[PDB]
Amino acid sequence: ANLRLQKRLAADVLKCGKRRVRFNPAHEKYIEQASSREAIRSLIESKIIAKLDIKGSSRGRIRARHAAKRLGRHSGHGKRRGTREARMPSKTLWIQR
Amino acid sequence: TANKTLSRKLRLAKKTKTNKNIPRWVIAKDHLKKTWNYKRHHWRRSHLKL
Amino acid sequence: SKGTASFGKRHTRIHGSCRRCGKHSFHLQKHECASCGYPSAKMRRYNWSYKSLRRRTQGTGSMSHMRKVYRAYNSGTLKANARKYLA
RNA sequence: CGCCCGGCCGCUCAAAAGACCUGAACCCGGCCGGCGCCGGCCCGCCGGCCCCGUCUCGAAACACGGACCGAGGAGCCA
RNA sequence: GCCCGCCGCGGUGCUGACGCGCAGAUCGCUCGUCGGAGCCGGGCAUGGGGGCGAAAGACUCAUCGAACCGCCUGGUAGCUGG
RNA sequence: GGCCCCGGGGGCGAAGGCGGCGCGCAGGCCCCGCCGGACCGGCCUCUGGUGCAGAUCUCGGCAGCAGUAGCGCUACUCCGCGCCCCGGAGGACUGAGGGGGAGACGGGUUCCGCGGCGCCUGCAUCUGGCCGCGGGUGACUCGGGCCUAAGCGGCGGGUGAAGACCGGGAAGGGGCGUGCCCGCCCGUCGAACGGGGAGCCGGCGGAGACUCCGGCAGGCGCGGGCGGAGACGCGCCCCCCGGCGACGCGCACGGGGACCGCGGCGGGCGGCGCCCCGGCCCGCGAACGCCCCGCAGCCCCCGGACGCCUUGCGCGGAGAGGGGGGCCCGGGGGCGGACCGCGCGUCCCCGGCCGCCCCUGAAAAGCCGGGGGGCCCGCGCGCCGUACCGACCGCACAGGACUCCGGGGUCAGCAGCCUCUAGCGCGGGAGCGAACGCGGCUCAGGGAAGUCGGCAAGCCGGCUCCGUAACCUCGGGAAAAGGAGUGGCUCUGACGGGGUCAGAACUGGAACGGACGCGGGGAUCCCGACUGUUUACUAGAAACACAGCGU
RNA sequence: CAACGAGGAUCCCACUGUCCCGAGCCGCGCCUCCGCGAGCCUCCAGCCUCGGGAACGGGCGAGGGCCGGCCAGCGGGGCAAG
RNA sequence: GGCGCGGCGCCCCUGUACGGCGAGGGCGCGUUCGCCCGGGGGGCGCGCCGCGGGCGCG
Numbered sequence A: 001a002n003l004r005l006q007k008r009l010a011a012d013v014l015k016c017g018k019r020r021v022r023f024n025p026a027h028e029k030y031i032e033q034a035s036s037r038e039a040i041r042s043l044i045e046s047k048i049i050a051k052l053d054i055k056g057s058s059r060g061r062i063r064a065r066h067a068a069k070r071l072g073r074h075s076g077h078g079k080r081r082g083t084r085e086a087r088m089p090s091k092t093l094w095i096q097r
Numbered sequence B: 001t002a003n004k005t006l007s008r009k010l011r012l013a014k015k016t017k018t019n020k021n022i023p024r025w026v027i028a029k030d031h032l033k034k035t036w037n038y039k040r041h042h043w044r045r046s047h048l049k050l
Numbered sequence C: 001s002k003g004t005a006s007f008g009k010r011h012t013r014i015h016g017s018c019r020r021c022g023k024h025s026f027h028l029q030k031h032e033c034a035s036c037g038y039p040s041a042k043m044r045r046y047n048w049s050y051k052s053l054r055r056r057t058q059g060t061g062s063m064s065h066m067r068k069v070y071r072a073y074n075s076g077t078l079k080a081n082a083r084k085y086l087a
Numbered sequence D: 001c002g003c004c005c006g007g008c009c010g011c012u013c014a015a016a017a018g019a020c021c022u023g024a025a026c027c028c029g030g031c032c033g034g035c036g037c038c039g040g041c042c043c044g045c046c047g048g049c050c051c052c053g054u055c056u057c058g059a060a061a062c063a064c065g066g067a068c069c070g071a072g073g074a075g076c077c078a
Numbered sequence E: 001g002c003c004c005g006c007c008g009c010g011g012u013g014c015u016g017a018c019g020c021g022c023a024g025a026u027c028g029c030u031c032g033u034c035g036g037a038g039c040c041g042g043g044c045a046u047g048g049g050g051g052c053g054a055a056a057g058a059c060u061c062a063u064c065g066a067a068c069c070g071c072c073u074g075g076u077a078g079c080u081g082g
Numbered sequence F: 001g002g003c004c005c006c007g008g009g010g011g012c013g014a015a016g017g018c019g020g021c022g023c024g025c026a027g028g029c030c031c032c033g034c035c036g037g038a039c040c041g042g043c044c045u046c047u048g049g050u051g052c053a054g055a056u057c058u059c060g061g062c063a064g065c066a067g068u069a070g071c072g073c074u075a076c077u078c079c080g081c082g083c084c085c086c087g088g089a090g091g092a093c094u095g096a097g098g099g100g101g102a103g104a105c106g107g108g109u110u111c112c113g114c115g116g117c118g119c120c121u122g123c124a125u126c127u128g129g130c131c132g133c134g135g136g137u138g139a140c141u142c143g144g145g146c147c148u149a150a151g152c153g154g155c156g157g158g159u160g161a162a163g164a165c166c167g168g169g170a171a172g173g174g175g176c177g178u179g180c181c182c183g184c185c186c187g188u189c190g191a192a193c194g195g196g197g198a199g200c201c202g203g204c205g206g207a208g209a210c211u212c213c214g215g216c217a218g219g220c221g222c223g224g225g226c227g228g229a230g231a232c233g234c235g236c237c238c239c240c241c242g243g244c245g246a247c248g249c250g251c252a253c254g255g256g257g258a259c260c261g262c263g264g265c266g267g268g269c270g271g272c273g274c275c276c277c278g279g280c281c282c283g284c285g286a287a288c289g290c291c292c293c294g295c296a297g298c299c300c301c302c303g304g305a306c307g308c309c310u311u312g313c314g315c316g317g318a319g320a321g322g323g324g325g326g327c328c329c330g331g332g333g334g335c336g337g338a339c340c341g342c343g344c345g346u347c348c349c350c351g352g353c354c355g356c357c358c359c360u361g362a363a364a365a366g367c368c369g370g371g372g373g374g375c376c377c378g379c380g381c382g383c384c385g386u387a388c389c390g391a392c393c394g395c396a397c398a399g400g401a402c403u404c405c406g407g408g409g410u411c412a413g414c415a416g417c418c419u420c421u422a423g424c425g426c427g428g429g430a431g432c433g434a435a436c437g438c439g440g441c442u443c444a445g446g447g448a449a450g451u452c453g454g455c456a457a458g459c460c461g462g463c464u465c466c467g468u469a470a471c472c473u474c475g476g477g478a479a480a481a482g483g484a485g486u487g488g489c490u491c492u493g494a495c496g497g498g499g500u501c502a503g504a505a506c507u508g509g510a511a512c513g514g515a516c517g518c519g520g521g522g523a524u525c526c527c528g529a530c531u532g533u534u535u536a537c538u539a540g541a542a543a544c545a546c547a548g549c550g551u
Numbered sequence G: 001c002a003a004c005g006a007g008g009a010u011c012c013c014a015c016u017g018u019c020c021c022g023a024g025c026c027g028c029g030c031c032u033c034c035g036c037g038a039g040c041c042u043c044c045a046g047c048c049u050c051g052g053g054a055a056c057g058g059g060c061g062a063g064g065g066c067c068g069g070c071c072a073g074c075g076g077g078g079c080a081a082g
Numbered sequence H: 001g002g003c004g005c006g007g008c009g010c011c012c013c014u015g016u017a018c019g020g021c022g023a024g025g026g027c028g029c030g031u032u033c034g035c036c037c038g039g040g041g042g043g044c045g046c047g048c049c050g051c052g053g054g055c056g057c058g
């Protein structure tokens, strides 16, 4: 009824954090009897224990805004915070030319 | 410290080993009523200067 | 900030264990004991503290050799052994 | 030993003396009675009564020390 | 030994909070400085009428117009208490 | 010290305790009842640490106050018998200078597994750094041992009443093999960040790993005279001359690695009222050995000059350019060990230059070269540290406490604000919605009349363009003062695949740095030239310092 | 004396709850409840007016008031505490 | 004082919902526009009705 040991041993076998290890709540009596990495490997086999994929951050809005920005959008004077020099240094332009 | 001389390790090792209760058969053998060993110490409130 | 905050800057050992007297009194930077005086050849003893004198002196330890010599003199055979030799 | 689910009852003992001899005061809980000192009367009326110790011409003082209780506590010796 | 500004280093005003504290000096906002006489860690040196001081009689382990510890010492009091 | 008439009172109940009569002017004494369970006295003579209400008395116990005052870090909820513990589902936070992952110092067993709630865990507990019982840290290659820094010891002796303190002027030791030869005189003290011979990948455990096991290597030891025109290429010992070890700061520019993105293609997911080849996850290759390739930079050969070349410079008759070569280069490739392209940046190291100083940026062990002279196969590698922690110091605690690694969006950005990975306490909860406080918000009309005093609060603020006075040590003043524009969408032009810069139409309460971040300004007088320093804990200044000047 | 200053002063523009003159709202404390649970202080006590008095009384002389027990608030007195 | 809970109507506040269909500077894409539409959402005020609303203590 205290499963701190199995949670720590499972994240070691699966190489993830303890925050993305999930037990099937049925079969909890099975998990309680496991004390070694070998008995934990059996449960990962019979699918009693699993790991979640990491959640990302969707880049669909980022990729659309960048697509619009190569068309000339979102880039007028109301959108600029740094000076012209900080945005495109005058020395970088001189050297290229 | 994780980097200690063998001489400090040995004196620390002895304070750990002698930090014990009176055995219960000793309490029956020597007919004692004081049962606490008052030379014990605990790491949170001690100042072993060793 | 000369009080509680200043005490949080302490992570040093001024004194360590003495090889002669065993106490937490050996100055690690001056290499001298503030209790027994080591590495001096004589022991540090002061008459302005007789309480410090009684804490570590003859008798506060085992007296292992001196005990045996006295009992041999008082009631054993040692006073006879001198007469054979001193003749 | 027994009975209920720690308690009760009771066992050892001259005695619980039961985590311990005796077990005072200050302070407190339960039952029962009643609504400060001195004096007269059997008894709640009438009469009298400022907080002690101290320094001081002078203290109830808006002068200082003192919540309460116990034990210790200061002219001896050469 | 330039200017705005982050961490860092400091400590202006609110005479704000707290003031039987979170704390025997702290917290919030505001503020000085930020390539330099800049800031930080370890080792080492200087010892009490002495040290050290961009100098405030400042600092020298919560102690400084003379540190701390034991002894001389039950120091002396024409003065307060009993 | 004595007496207490057959040798004083006592378990047939001593001393003490609690109540109650009596006697004495009083200090006090005597008796009775109950408690208690072993010792105690009246009279004469002797002796003293011999009598308490007080001293901010000392030590111990303890009342009212009073069930009172009180219990920073955004946050938990439902179900599982359910506790703040554990599981599942949801909702949030820390926000890569982390409430993340690890070391140094300090602590010392706090580490791990099983059990448990007496103490502690200021509420609870079935939780736990608490309590009981078992366990736990493996090295030729990592550090310590070695070297020396600033220092500190030692030194025939010297000095002082000594303790002790001070010190080169001393017949100062080695190689061997006898016997010759050579020789001026300390430290196996002082760094777990400096110097230093050599380690990488995969796997296994409840708690250890660059240490174990398997594999692949590396280091230090021990035993069985040629080629070239040239730059250059391919055993030892002593004396002397050298080298490596071995070194500051800086804006920039260049190269590599790692990270990070976009697109393809291969495998797997999610949700799906409409749309979706538009969302998410995974596609991995070390040390070491051999071959090739390496910009700058320095060198060789021919030959004899109005050029070569950098972002900047810089270079050449003391021999440029051009043609052909050599050496260095912490790197890359191919084969071993054993999925495919293209980009802007960020961090780290390296390169060649240039700038700066009345500042010029350690030493030694160890290892090597030169000149001169004399002459493949086996075995092994000892000693010590190694668990864990901000569990450390502040009497236990919003204080104090060195370093390393550092993703995405917005953006000038290591700022603010939101977030993937990882991690999840913070002396406890519920109800009500008074005064009053503490931290916040808004206010008609007026606008400092308030107050010692504009204290506090508010106005200003990003970026682009326009426009900027007095005075001045000519450098400044200066963001002086003041103005205007700024979103979304559809497009166009410029630069050699990449962002930026410029312009236009259309459109929306008459809006646009829409949150966040972010100067109010001006005219003067006094003091000190300026940056800097200070009363740790009531004084930051006009005080100290300073360059300059003078004695 | 240009430049510089968390240095001492006077004035103006702009700005505002500083003020005329205050009003409404948010969170957290307070408040009520379950659990937990202290400090300071205390001669004895705790209603006034006048007189006398160590010349400003809770108590003393004379008058006027007053069942007893408690809460949320508050700062006149207790010559309140330190 | 047999509560209230939850509805439907009225009346108010904001300012015309999502969607469907048909104008839009431009190059099937497109901010925005018009119409259904003083609409949709909301209510702590007013009016009338599905589940319900008279214990135990002195």
Ligand SMILES: [K+]
Binding pocket: A070, A071
């Ligand atoms: K483009």
Ligand SMILES: [K+]
Binding pocket: B001, B002, B003
């Ligand atoms: K260790």
Ligand SMILES: [K+]
Binding pocket: B043, B044, B045, B046, B047, F107
């Ligand atoms: K400790």
Ligand SMILES: [K+]
Binding pocket: C001, C002, C003, C004, C005, C006, E025
């Ligand atoms: K402090």
Ligand SMILES: [K+]
Binding pocket: C026, C027, C030, C032, C033, C034
């Ligand atoms: K010493």
Ligand SMILES: [K+]
Binding pocket: D054, D055
């Ligand atoms: K007095």
Ligand SMILES: [K+]
Binding pocket: D055
């Ligand atoms: K006096």
Ligand SMILES: [K+]
Binding pocket: D056
């Ligand atoms: K007098």
Ligand SMILES: [K+]
Binding pocket: D059
């Ligand atoms: K008196």
Ligand SMILES: [K+]
Binding pocket: D061, D062
């Ligand atoms: K008086």
Ligand SMILES: [K+]
Binding pocket: none
């Ligand atoms: K009084």
Ligand SMILES: [K+]
Binding pocket: D055, D056, D063
């Ligand atoms: K007096």
Ligand SMILES: [K+]
Binding pocket: none
């Ligand atoms: K007084």
Ligand SMILES: [K+]
Binding pocket: D064
């Ligand atoms: K008094």
Ligand SMILES: [K+]
Binding pocket: none
């Ligand atoms: K700062």
Ligand SMILES: [K+]
Binding pocket: E016
């Ligand atoms: K305030």
